[PDB]
Design an enzyme around this catalytic site. Structure first.
Site, PDB file in Angstrom:
ATOM      1  N   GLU A 150      -6.114 -11.247  -0.351  1.00  0.00           N
ATOM      2  CA  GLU A 150      -6.972 -10.899   0.797  1.00  0.00           C
ATOM      3  C   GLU A 150      -8.440 -10.865   0.329  1.00  0.00           C
ATOM      4  OE1 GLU A 150      -5.598  -7.330   2.841  1.00  0.00           O
ATOM      5  OE2 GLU A 150      -3.482  -7.848   2.506  1.00  0.00           O
ATOM      6  N   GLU A 205       0.829  -1.232   0.000  1.00  0.00           N
ATOM      7  CA  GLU A 205       0.000   0.000   0.000  1.00  0.00           C
ATOM      8  C   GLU A 205       0.841   1.248   0.000  1.00  0.00           C
ATOM      9  OE1 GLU A 205      -2.980  -0.266   3.007  1.00  0.00           O
ATOM     10  OE2 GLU A 205      -3.664  -2.341   2.426  1.00  0.00           O
TER      11      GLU A 205
END
Length: 337
Positions: A250, A142
């Site tokens: 995820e 991220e």
């Protein structure tokens, strides 16, 4: 409890497609039913929180770092003993890393060189400890913010180091364990400008010989967005960079639209159906791209364990198994994809 031990194993059903993984907390390793479920259905696990910097780090001395590895050892040993993979998650993230990590003993922010030196020791010590035992690491998580003109999240990492913290993390992780596959991991990979930034970053790293082997698409998605074809476009574009594999890291699928006033106490049957159909389409698509899609992990064992409930504060049903361990409509659609 209503687990059905007789139904087809997800991971065995996908034997000739790709690894199928599950994120779990530590409690699951030593719960009899959780453990049995994990080993029936999954041939990869990810530690939901226990391999992040806040969990591994105990503190600092004047010159180095001290660590707490016993829970993370339990994760890596579980995987070793049951002969399943474990994805290491995650070495560098703006979240879940202690504020004191970015500072000296006195609380003063570390200089670029000192932060980088601390990253290098961290990665050498963590990745080194588990050398040979971790098939894939999420090295950097991220790092992209599509609202910035240069595409970089203005995290402490970036503020202190500029963008070279990314490439250096991969260099050092590859030195510490040359046979681990190293990933850049991110969410909202179907947001147009974000996908572009992620693609250009990784292409440029690769062009220069940075040892990145993979893009992790988190895929925290919902029943209405993004489309399967949008997700396919990401896969095509990302895996167009030579040497870049895909892990779906995820995966989960909320029954809500983002920002919605809707609030359910039981899952509407029609949404459970739409969820099943969408999961099926996704997985039919993923099979198509099994040459580059190597591992697909769900972010939770079953619906009541989903991080979404506590994060957004309302009940949700994002996964393939219900709170009682029973297989959902999604489970049946996915095994037939």
């Amino acid at each position: 409890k209503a687990p059905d031990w007789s139904i087809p194993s997800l991971c065995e059903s996908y034997k000739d497609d790709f690894i199928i993984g599950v994120a779990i907390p530590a409690r699951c390793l030593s719960n009899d039913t959780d453990k049995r479920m994990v080993l029936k259905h999954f041939n990869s696990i990810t530690a939901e929180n226990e391999m992040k910097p806040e969990s591994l780090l105990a503190g600092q001395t004047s010159t180095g770092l001290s660590y707490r590895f016993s829970t993370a050892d339990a994760f890596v040993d579980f995987a070793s003993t049951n002969k399943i993979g474990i994805r290491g998650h995650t070495l560098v993230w703006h979240n879940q890393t202690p504020d004191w990590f970015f500072k000296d003993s006195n609380g003063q922010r570390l200089s670029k060189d000192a932060l980088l030196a601390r990253l290098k020791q961290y990665i050498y010590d963590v990745v080194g400890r588990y050398k040979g035992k971790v098939y894939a690491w999420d090295v950097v998580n991220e790092a992209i913010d599509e609202n910035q003109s240069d595409g970089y999240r203005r995290s402490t990492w970036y503020e202190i180091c500029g963008p070279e913290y990314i490439e250096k993390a991969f260099i050092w992780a590859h030195e510490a364990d040359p046979n681990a596959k190293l990933f850049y991991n991110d969410y909202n990979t179907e947001i147009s400008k974000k996908r572009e930034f992620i693609y250009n970053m990784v292409k440029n790293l690769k062009s220069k010989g940075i040892p990145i082997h993979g893009i992790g698409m988190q895929c925290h998605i919902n029943v209405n967005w993004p489309s399967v074809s949008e997700i396919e476009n990401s896969i095509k574009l990302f895996s167009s960079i030579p040497g870049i594999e895909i892990h779906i890291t995820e995966l989960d699928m909320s029954l809500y639209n983002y920002g919605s006033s809707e609030n359910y106490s039981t899952p509407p049957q029609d949404l459970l159906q739409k969820q099943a159909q969408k999961y099926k389409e996704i997985f039919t698509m993923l099979k198509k791209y099994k040459n580059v899609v190597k591992s697909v992990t769900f972010w939770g064992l079953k619906d009541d364990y989903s991080w979404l409930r506590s994060f957004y504060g309302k009940n949700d049903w994002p996964l393939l198994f219900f709170e009682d361990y029973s297989a959902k409509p999604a489970y049946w659609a996915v095994i037939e994809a």
